[PDB]
Subunit: 29 residues, 3 copies
């Protein structure tokens, strides 16, 4: 249970950072 949550959490953090860069690129272009 713990491991399943932490792994899902790390993946969501990586996605979060990627979407922040994507939104900035969308605004900036």
């Amino acid at each position: 249970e713990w491991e399943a949550l932490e792994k899902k959490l790390a993946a969501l953090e990586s996605k979060x950072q990627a979407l922040e860069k994507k939104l900035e690129a969308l605004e900036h272009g």
Copy 2:
């Protein structure tokens, strides 16, 4: 408390995916 962490993670995973869907629709649309 653990159930609340699971529920928060699931709701944020869905929020995360919904935002990704709009960003991908707009950047290739």
Copy 3:
């Protein structure tokens, strides 16, 4: 530590709200 997970989830939720806010301002720009 469960507080470490709580903190990471809170930071992701704040990032999620910040990106949604900026995307909404962009789309309505």
